[PDB]
Amino acid sequence: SMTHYDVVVLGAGPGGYVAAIRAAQLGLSTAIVEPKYWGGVCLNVGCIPSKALLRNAELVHIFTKDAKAFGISGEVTFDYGIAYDRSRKVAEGRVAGVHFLMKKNKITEIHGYGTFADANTLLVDLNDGGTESVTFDNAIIATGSSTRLVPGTSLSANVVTYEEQILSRELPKSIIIAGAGAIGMEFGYVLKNYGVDVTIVEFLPRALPNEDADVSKEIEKQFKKLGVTILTATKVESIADGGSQVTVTVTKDGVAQELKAEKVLQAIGFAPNVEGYGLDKAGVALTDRKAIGVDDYMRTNVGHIYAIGDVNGLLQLAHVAEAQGVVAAETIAGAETLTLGDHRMLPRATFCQPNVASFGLTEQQARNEGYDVVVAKFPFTANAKAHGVGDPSGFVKLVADAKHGELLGGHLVGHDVAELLPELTLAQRWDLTASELARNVHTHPTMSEALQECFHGLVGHMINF
Amino acid sequence: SMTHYDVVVLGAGPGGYVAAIRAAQLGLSTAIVEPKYWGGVCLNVGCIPSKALLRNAELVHIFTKDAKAFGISGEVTFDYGIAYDRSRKVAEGRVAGVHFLMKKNKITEIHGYGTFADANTLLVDLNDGGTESVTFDNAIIATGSSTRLVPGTSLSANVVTYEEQILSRELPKSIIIAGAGAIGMEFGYVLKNYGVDVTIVEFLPRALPNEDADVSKEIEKQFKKLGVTILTATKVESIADGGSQVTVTVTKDGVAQELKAEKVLQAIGFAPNVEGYGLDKAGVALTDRKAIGVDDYMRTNVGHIYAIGDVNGLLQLAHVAEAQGVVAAETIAGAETLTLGDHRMLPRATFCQPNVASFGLTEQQARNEGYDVVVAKFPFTANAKAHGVGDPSGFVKLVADAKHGELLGGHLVGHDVAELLPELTLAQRWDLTASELARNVHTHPTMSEALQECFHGLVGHMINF
Numbered sequence A, B: 001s002m003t004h005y006d007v008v009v010l011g012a013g014p015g016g017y018v019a020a021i022r023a024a025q026l027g028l029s030t031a032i033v034e035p036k037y038w039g040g041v042c043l044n045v046g047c048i049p050s051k052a053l054l055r056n057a058e059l060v061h062i063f064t065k066d067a068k069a070f071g072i073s074g075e076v077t078f079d080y081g082i083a084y085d086r087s088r089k090v091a092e093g094r095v096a097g098v099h100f101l102m103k104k105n106k107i108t109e110i111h112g113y114g115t116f117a118d119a120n121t122l123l124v125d126l127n128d129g130g131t132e133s134v135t136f137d138n139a140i141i142a143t144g145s146s147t148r149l150v151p152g153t154s155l156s157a158n159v160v161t162y163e164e165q166i167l168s169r170e171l172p173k174s175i176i177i178a179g180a181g182a183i184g185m186e187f188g189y190v191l192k193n194y195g196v197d198v199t200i201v202e203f204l205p206r207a208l209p210n211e212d213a214d215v216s217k218e219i220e221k222q223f224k225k226l227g228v229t230i231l232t233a234t235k236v237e238s239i240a241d242g243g244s245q246v247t248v249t250v251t252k253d254g255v256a257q258e259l260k261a262e263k264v265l266q267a268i269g270f271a272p273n274v275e276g277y278g279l280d281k282a283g284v285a286l287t288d289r290k291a292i293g294v295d296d297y298m299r300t301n302v303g304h305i306y307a308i309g310d311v312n313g314l315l316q317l318a319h320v321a322e323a324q325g326v327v328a329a330e331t332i333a334g335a336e337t338l339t340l341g342d343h344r345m346l347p348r349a350t351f352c353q354p355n356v357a358s359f360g361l362t363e364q365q366a367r368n369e370g371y372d373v374v375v376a377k378f379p380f381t382a383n384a385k386a387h388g389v390g391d392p393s394g395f396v397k398l399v400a401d402a403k404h405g406e407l408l409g410g411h412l413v414g415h416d417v418a419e420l421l422p423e424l425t426l427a428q429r430w431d432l433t434a435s436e437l438a439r440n441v442h443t444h445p446t447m448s449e450a451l452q453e454c455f456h457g458l459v460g461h462m463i464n465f
């Protein structure tokens, strides 16, 4: 078959399908090619299902630890199979929503796998058998990333990635998780609350090493109190699957040690998908770290080809993919757009309980980049709402530049703190300083009150602390 | 006793003790007079214990009605006595924090009841017996408000206000709540979840009549599905306490009916405290509704006397009392301050399930005042986190001016929406329009994403809806 489009999107993840919607809004003939996951990893086996499981795990946590505090009585069991069932129903509903949005915007769905023939032609191997040739004036690459394995290791029946694990309705008696990033910590939180013995191994000296160091130590303590064994500054050397048990050999300070569990989860990182679909035949250049290179407008070395989402490796998150897709579409249409700038200023959150939420530079990074840093730290022990909900742990930490009080970063750990970033990222984008932020009245009693107290600390002295 | 201070504050509620803190930070000799409640109504018998009880009630709803959906083998029991005990423990902890803040800022506590002798003299009947004569350069009246009763009715053993009810460890079998404001609805939510038969009567034709009409319909539906009987456009004629039962005669459409229950809660409104402490001797003028009149800087008609908090009746909320206290202190000291202007723009929230959160003008009010209005509404059924937590009900509704997209109001109902207001009020006060707001990236998956989609709808078309 043969067809031609103004814009062709490769991949239907959060970046791709939002890129297609914006292009359609701008009056561009648009098609999107996807062979497997409509909504990509996020909606099928990522953000959507994992957060439903985290909610279920949270309820187990409340009951097993705080039943006395909340005056709860009764003998009950929590079935993980029902938790799994609900996560699949929630995922399937949002996948349907993606199809609704494609049709609403009159976007052509092409069900197959695309390979670049040249800089303007794409060959599609169709799922329902057959082949089709699609040409385009512009292309938006949104092919995602894949799990990076520990060097030397392989996958097997008892060594898995997030995909086989999140799709498992039955759990093992013990698991060893390689990687203390957000993914590894979230799985550890779910499995531990449902009775699994969990050990997490991280090569770097802190769990969640991308976060501010104060956040790392708070989350490590919470997870250890939850019963999770956390080994930081520890290197994984090998993984031996023996069917009846998996032996993991690790090293710390030159000493070797063998760990054993029924299963192992590989969660050390994700590599952009760049092989097997003709990036060479299109002339697309990769970076030194094997991600598709792009400029501020998500444009590759080829001017009419863009790369958005996890494949450019800038910040592998769903809301980042969506944003990059909007920039790309508005650039193609010559529309008014706004570049994202330094991707470190973008927000991010981890949805174990307590949540972790942050944007911008850590205190250490701000000082290491020559800023005259001012810091304000408010503990949730001085927050009325945090005591009301029964979780007074955590803090809000804001980093600012002393000259005008412009925000450099924010780092939160506490109950449902993920919802508190919008005020901070807005002020940072539009040059609102702490002296203006401190005048914004926050509703009482809310966790967000901790933000206001931090503003008072950046410009002067706190009031309720 | 005979002492003099630059600033004397009357009442230790959120307005009084924050105003005292700000005065101290500004180098003013400050004293504060309180006979009963340090932290006022809010910390002792208001915001603080109320939100602890509402947390307990939230957990009852999750673990009983949603037990099988979350895979719980049975329905556990919640003991209200333990919920009461935790609420008193939380309240005590925050009251102790106020005393800590007074000492930290070197503020002089005067334990007694103050009465004005003239415009510069306060006679304090000390709790420990004696009397003290306090003179001042400036005074800050922060005496709060008291419950309004239905005309012609009286308090008795089975007819109570918020204060007696929130301090009860044992619940009745049935109750009739007069008034469907935020306080009436919250008590109704707590008591209903703990097994009480609840009927709420409201004179106006909508529950939560101060919110946007759309919000009222949603919350009425949720409360009715919860088992609460709601009678609107219904007037209370009489309340007859007969020991073993209370008979409440109500009328709707010229038709009378008798409602019977074990107890009755009066929650129709609150009247500023203006009697019994010598406002006449100080010459402070009252409004036509019997509140202390103030200008934008909280000054009364007497240039050196101020009135903050509920006693001025502008907006009877704790965070409003705090902000007015900061304005009063800064004005007294001659420091840079920012008036609150139109108080309808300040935020507010109600903490039942679902939460209700709003600021600014309703759609009905905005049109009524001549604005050319644009409205964007996003339902949480299209939000990924809402399904994950198990509550996709509610919506986000933003009202903006069509000339430049300036925000006029925002109205939210749903899971945890109380925490989502800071971004909205920040943009409204520093003149950020829907165009700038739409560019602020929101973390995925959060409830706050529905805010960003609303921004898109105001500027053009929504993406995920």
Ligand SMILES: Cc1cc2nc3c(=O)[nH]c(=O)nc-3n(C[C@H](O)[C@H](O)[C@H](O)COP(=O)(O)OP(=O)(O)OC[C@H]3O[C@@H](n4cnc5c(N)ncnc54)[C@H](O)[C@@H]3O)c2cc1C
Pocket (backbone or CB within 6 Å): A010, A011, A012, A013, A014, A015, A016, A033, A034, A035, A036, A037, A038, A039, A040, A041, A042, A043, A045, A046, A047, A048, A050, A051, A112, A113, A114, A115, A142, A143, A144, A145, A162, A166, A183, A273, A277, A308, A309, A310, A311, A316, A317, A318, A319, A320, A321, A351, B444, B445
């Ligand atoms: C367990 C887990 C939990 C996560 N939780 C969160 C979270 O809470 N928040 C968050 O922001 N992020 C989260 N993430 C990350 C999130 O999933 C990714 O950032 C996001 O999915 C990236 O979107 P994308 O469109 O760039 O790529 P993807 O979502 O991976 O989509 C790429 C798509 O392209 C398709 N494709 C690939 N090659 C081709 C080709 N040649 N032709 C056609 N189609 C092709 C693939 O089939 C795939 O469906 C999570 C990830 C995991 C694994």
Ligand SMILES: Cc1cc2nc3c(=O)[nH]c(=O)nc-3n(C[C@H](O)[C@H](O)[C@H](O)COP(=O)(O)OP(=O)(O)OC[C@H]3O[C@@H](n4cnc5c(N)ncnc54)[C@H](O)[C@@H]3O)c2cc1C
Pocket (backbone or CB within 6 Å): A444, A445, B010, B011, B012, B013, B014, B015, B016, B033, B034, B035, B036, B037, B038, B039, B040, B041, B042, B043, B045, B046, B047, B048, B050, B112, B113, B114, B115, B142, B143, B144, B145, B162, B166, B183, B273, B277, B308, B309, B310, B311, B316, B317, B318, B319, B320, B321
């Ligand atoms: C059940 C309930 C729940 C509430 N929940 C919330 C909520 O979630 N959020 C919110 O924002 N608001 C809430 N409120 C409202 C909140 O309590 C008030 O808005 C707030 O307390 C007002 O503070 P204030 O300092 O102005 O007055 P108050 O807090 O009432 O303090 C006034 C103080 O002045 C003292 N006083 C009076 N006369 C004198 C005198 N002559 N001499 C000396 N001292 C004197 C009184 O003893 C009292 O302690 C709630 C109220 C109730 C009843």
Ligand SMILES: Cc1cc(S(=O)(=O)N(C)CC(=O)Nc2ccn(C)c(=O)c2)c2[nH]ncc2c1
Pocket (backbone or CB within 6 Å): A014, A042, A043, A048, A093, A094, A095, A096, A097, A098, A100, A101, A318, A322, B382, B383, B384, B444, B449, B450, B453, B464, B465
């Ligand atoms: C990455 C992502 C995913 C979702 S989403 O997973 O919730 N989703 C794909 C949206 C959705 O389903 N829309 C609709 C609309 C109408 N009708 C009838 C539907 O059936 C479905 C996000 N929501 N908001 C922000 C957002 C971001």
Ligand SMILES: Cc1cc(S(=O)(=O)N(C)CC(=O)Nc2ccn(C)c(=O)c2)c2[nH]ncc2c1
Pocket (backbone or CB within 6 Å): A382, A383, A384, A444, A449, A450, A453, A464, A465, B014, B042, B043, B048, B093, B094, B095, B096, B097, B098, B100, B101, B318
């Ligand atoms: C109306 C109100 C009440 C509280 S509050 O009820 O939480 N409170 C009175 C603050 C508090 O207790 N501070 C401290 C500080 C130090 N030490 C050692 C303490 O013991 C207690 C609010 N917090 N944030 C905002 C806010 C607003």
